[PDB]
Amino acid sequence: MLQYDLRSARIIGNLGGMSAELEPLLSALHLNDTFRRSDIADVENAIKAKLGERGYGSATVNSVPDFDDANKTLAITLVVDAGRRLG
Known part of the structure; x- marks a missing residue:
């Protein structure tokens, strides 16, 4: 039932050089437009798959909101950590 719009999005953290x-x-x-959880999951998966391709197989992604309840918007920040390549 969340009807806020997604106002913006960004990626930050440790991007393994793949920014x-x-x-x-x-x-x-x-x-x-209205926020959609599955759109954020898809991005998170794509990030991890891109990073997997360069050897960052344990990469994490955590999406953090910033709500503006006045305007019924949220900003999403995807906090990436690429992790170690292999070992």
Whole structure:
């Protein structure tokens, strides 16, 4: 029943050098429209898959909101940690 719109999104943290390859994945999110959990999960999975491809197989992603209850918006920050390559 969450009817806030997603106002913005960003990726931060430890991106294993792949910041430029991750950033375009955010273009899948529907900004200024109703928030959709599954759109955020899809981005989180894509991030981890891109990072997997360079050897960061234990990468984590945690999506953190910033709510504006006045405007009925939230910003999402995807906090990435690439982890160790292999060992």
